[PDB]
Write a protein that binds this ligand. Structure first.
Ligand SMILES: [Zn+2]
Ligand SMILES: [Zn+2]
Ligand SMILES: [Zn+2]
Length: 83
């Protein structure tokens, strides 16, 4: 496919800013067990490194997802969405 997702990741931004909740772009996604209000959350790599620094996190797989951190559905607010 195109490099558009990889480029967005390289810019350091959250992938929700290009996926919203209506598309499922393909990239690496992670899970945060510390912020588990939603049970099987999927979090983009920039959010896991910044919004979940020091949290209990795991890489899950490279597959289609939209970022639950940027969507605003986790216990904590996304630090890549406007602070
Ligand atoms: Zn994100
Ligand atoms: Zn977390
Ligand atoms: Zn985030």
């Amino acid at each position: 496919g195109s490099d558009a997702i990889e480029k967005a990741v390289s810019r350091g931004q959250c992938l929700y800013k290009i996926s919203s909740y209506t598309s499922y772009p393909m990239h690496d996604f992670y899970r945060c067990h510390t912020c588990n209000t939603t049970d099987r959350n999927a979090i983009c790599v920039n959010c896991i490194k910044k919004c979940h620094q020091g949290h209990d996190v795991e890489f899950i797989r490279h597959d289609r997802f939209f970022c639950d951190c940027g969507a605003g559905t986790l216990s904590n607010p996304c630090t890549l969405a406007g602070e």
